[PDB]
Amino acid sequence: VPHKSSLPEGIAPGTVLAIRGLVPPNASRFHVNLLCGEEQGSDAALHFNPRLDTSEVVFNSKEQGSWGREERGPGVPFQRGQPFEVLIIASDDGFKAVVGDAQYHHFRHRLPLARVRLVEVGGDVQLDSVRIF
Q: Which residues bind a copy of itself (CB under 8 A)?
A: 22, 24-26, 51, 53-54, 60, 65-70, 79-83, 126, 128-129
What does the alpha-carbon distance between residue 68 and residue 71 come to, in Å, rounded to a whole number?
9
What does the alpha-carbon distance between residue 1 and residue 125 come to, in Å, rounded to a whole number?
10
What does the alpha-carbon distance between residue 26 and residue 15 come to, in Å, rounded to a whole number?
32
- Please answer whether residues 108 and 92 qualify as being in contact, where contact means their C-beta atoms are separated by less than 8 angstroms: no
Binding residues for a beta-D-galactoside: 67-73
- What's the min distance (Å) between Cβ of 62 and a copy of itself? 8
Q: Residue 93 or 128: which CB sits closer to a copy of itself?
A: 128
Q: Residue 67 or 133: which CB sits closer to a copy of itself?
A: 67
Binding residues: 67-73
Q: Residue 5 or 26: which CB sits closer to a copy of itself?
A: 26
- What's the min distance (Å) between Cβ of 13 and a copy of itself? 27
Q: Where are the beta strands (DSSP E) in 1-133?
A: 3-6, 15-22, 30-35, 44-51, 56-63, 66-67, 71-72, 83-90, 94-99, 102-108, 118-123, 126-132
- What's the min distance (Å) between Cβ of 47 and a copy of itself? 11
Q: Residue 34 or 125: which CB sits closer to a copy of itself?
A: 125
CA distances from 16 to 13, 92, 98 (A): 9, 13, 10
- What's the min distance (Å) between Cβ of 7 and a copy of itself? 19
